Amino acid sequence: LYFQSMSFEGKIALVTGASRGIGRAIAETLVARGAKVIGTATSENGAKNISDYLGANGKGLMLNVTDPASIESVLENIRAEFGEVDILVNNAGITRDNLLMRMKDDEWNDIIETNLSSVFRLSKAVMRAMMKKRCGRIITIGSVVGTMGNAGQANYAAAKAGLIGFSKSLAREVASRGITVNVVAPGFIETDMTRALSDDQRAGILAQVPAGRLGGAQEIASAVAFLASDEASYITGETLHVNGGMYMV
Amino acid sequence: MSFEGKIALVTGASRGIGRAIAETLVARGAKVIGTATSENGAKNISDYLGANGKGLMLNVTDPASIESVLENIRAEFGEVDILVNNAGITRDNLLMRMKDDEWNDIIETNLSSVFRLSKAVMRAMMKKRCGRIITIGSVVGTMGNAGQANYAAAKAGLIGFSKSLAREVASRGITVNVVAPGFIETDMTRALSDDQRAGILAQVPAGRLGGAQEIASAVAFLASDEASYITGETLHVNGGMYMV
Amino acid sequence: MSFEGKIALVTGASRGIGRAIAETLVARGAKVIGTATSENGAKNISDYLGANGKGLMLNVTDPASIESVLENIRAEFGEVDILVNNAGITRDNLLMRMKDDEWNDIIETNLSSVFRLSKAVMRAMMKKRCGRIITIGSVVGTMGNAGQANYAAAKAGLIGFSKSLAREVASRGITVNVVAPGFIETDMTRALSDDQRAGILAQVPAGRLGGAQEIASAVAFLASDEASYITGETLHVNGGMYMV
Amino acid sequence: MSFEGKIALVTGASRGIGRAIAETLVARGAKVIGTATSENGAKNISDYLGANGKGLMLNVTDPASIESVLENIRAEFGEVDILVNNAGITRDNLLMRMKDDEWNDIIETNLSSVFRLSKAVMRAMMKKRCGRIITIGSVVGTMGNAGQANYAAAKAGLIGFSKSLAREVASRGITVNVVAPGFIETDMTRALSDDQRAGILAQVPAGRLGGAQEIASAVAFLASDEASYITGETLHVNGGMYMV
């Protein structure tokens, strides 16, 4: 058919933090376009819920990214059940905001490990298969903070800017072999949180966003799905900013 | 389908990028007006667009010619939903050899045309509270290129334009973005020598030249309803030639 | 001092940044030729430069005046070692109300001026394998700003020009760089309501408006021998209003 | 534009960039504490600083060592007015061969160090409502480099960190900045193949490797009272290797 290349069938997609919000939006979108999605979560309850909504189109698994041992059996589980990972989506970002003078060492370490080093560990683990296949996608869910900096979020900003630098390097290494490594940088996105924010709080967030709204989880998903698709094979080492104009370039 | 009931103006749609954009939109359900400098240009456009659209003669540097094409489109189709600025030429030279008119032509055709055509479509977009303005820039504007300072000013300047404009119209559901292609295989690049081509390909980690559809796919995404939260942004499609 | 024996050409040197640049360069041992739009401006410019330089009337849009000015500089002083391009103007308006003329004037004065003046001083710089071209841009060209789509097209455009030019002449000991002021205190800003100056200060983490001298110090640094490994770069001096 | 009465702490001051930073501030009136990871390197720093400062041993990945140095410095000198983070190392490998600790050591030596040292001198700079933080980055953090993904992630992270700390302390008259060297001639550099050196020079329009003093000047300018309106900015010193 015309648009035959547009399908994701035959492709295996690994999405981290797929329990809610963006991550769930990504997994659902990829499945809707024909891919088998494996979503991962931090707890065993998180994994089961993911398996629930993926149903027959994929699998939930509990992956504790920080533990290198956790990665190995999760990838092996996928290889045995589905196969090698065609598409890696790194979406396991947390936040531990504080100003610098009040910032605890653990809050710095846990942000660096969960948001920055998680990317390196997972990218490495899926790297080799995509190089044999000569086709691959790595997309990391970044943040406008990494570009702009935000007071009280120096750890976040450091992690989110680091994964851009990490991606550009990886891109240069694997570009020649049909692998793509990009970042999607969201602005304020509406979540399970935000709905309980106060009118004053919600106003102050909106003042920052020229578009005058918060973005949708799906808006991030559709960026990710385009970049993970066969018509984005010429984009690597790039950051696709989805923030309603809160920042530019 | 995806652009059900949307009217798109693609300037410079005779070939390459422009033709690939027009057809991608038509293939996804838009009425498409594609533009050319010449009669046969416009005629041949209308030929390949057939029932899904129409080719018109447009001179992006002439205010009167803009006035007629848009007034022409309004009469028969309606108001423009999606504007793609893909006019743009080169006149390369080192600075020390660049003629004043080689500068001015590149400025008029590749930068000031972006101002004229966007202003002309925006009133209606502001009123409708929805829209898309998309401009085809170039890696050159971000990276700079010896022998192309006029191109680099124009392609850089269309980004600064887009940003400001994107701030003026963000609140009313209009996005304004730039797709910045790297080296895209064209007639002229197939005409290069073996040694020149090697020099091009050496700059591109991906190891190939890009295809026009690759730009077309990027533009259709940004013009779609799923790209609504992206404004004032530059989507680089250069195979790794340059990064961020 | 740092600039002994060097000849500097500072365009728009009547007041503000232009004057502060001219004064700093004199302080540090340079013979400076400042320009102004009027013969009266040149009067004042010569008045404050004294035996360290001279004022001249220069119309950056007119090739005829560009040549005349350069002949007189070569006659009375020698070959321009340092070109500082600071002949910017403003014509703010929203896109819907921007006149064709407000666009063109900004593009001519603020962008195309950098092309003509850089081109005119460049040959001598390459003959001596040493030189400095520094253009005064604006944060607006990087972040964009509603009502300043013409100014931002230009301020961004001159960065694309500088990146290309830098690549053409790096091999020959010349640097081409841009200094980007955020909000700088001028007589125009001093004249603003308390509400307006509050709104500006909210945008600037440093709590203040920058000073003309602060821009000059960045220019003086880039023009020095301590910046000879810096080319193609933008130096943002905006108290944190925008970052990178 | 002296640094009289100022106390500057340059981590990684044994040789090269850090020793030129250290020496240059001394020459402009600063008392300087230079650091190294071994007590011998700390000895050699004391020797060349002599009367104008002192060397000390600092393990930037250890909070204990950080406190020991800083309380020492408060004793003999006072509070740190100026902080230069020049304590990068590399641990190069393509991603498939990069081991966990090779990733971890570079993140902790080149990025978390910036966090730990910056917090460590921040409070005193906040009470005095004046300060300077400058981190030595790398063009690699901006453009990315194959086989350097850990180095680039860190060198980029420290720009993101610097941007938000700048926002936190800008209103109290402290700037936080990055200098991003390109290829800088070192002892390790002069000792490579002609083939290697030629391949480094291939990437630099300036035609040459940068010097350690050139980076020191950028740092010296940024730490001066003339750079008070620059914060959250990266200043790229790379011969045009990369642009903006």
UniProtKB/Swiss-Prot annotation, chain A:
- Which amino acid positions bind Ca(2+) 3, per UniProt? 238-239
Q: Which SUPFAM superfamilies match?
A: NAD(P)-binding Rossmann-fold domains
Name the active site residues.
Answer: 156
Q: Which residues bind Ca(2+) 1 per the record?
A: 55, 58
Q: Quote the EC number.
A: 1.1.1.100
Which pathway is it part of? Lipid metabolism; fatty acid biosynthesis
**Binding positions (substrate):** 143
Q: Which residues bind NADP(+)?
A: 17-20, 42, 64-65, 91, 156-160, 189
Which InterPro entries does this chain map to?
3oxo_ACP_reduc, NAD(P)-bd_dom_sf, Sc_DH/Rdtase_CS, SDR, SDR_fam
Q: Which family does it belong to?
A: Belongs to the short-chain dehydrogenases/reductases (SDR) family.
Instruction: Tell me what this protein is called.
Output: 3-oxoacyl-[acyl-carrier-protein] reductase FabG
Q: What's the source species for this entry?
A: Salmonella typhimurium (strain LT2 / SGSC1412 / ATCC 700720)
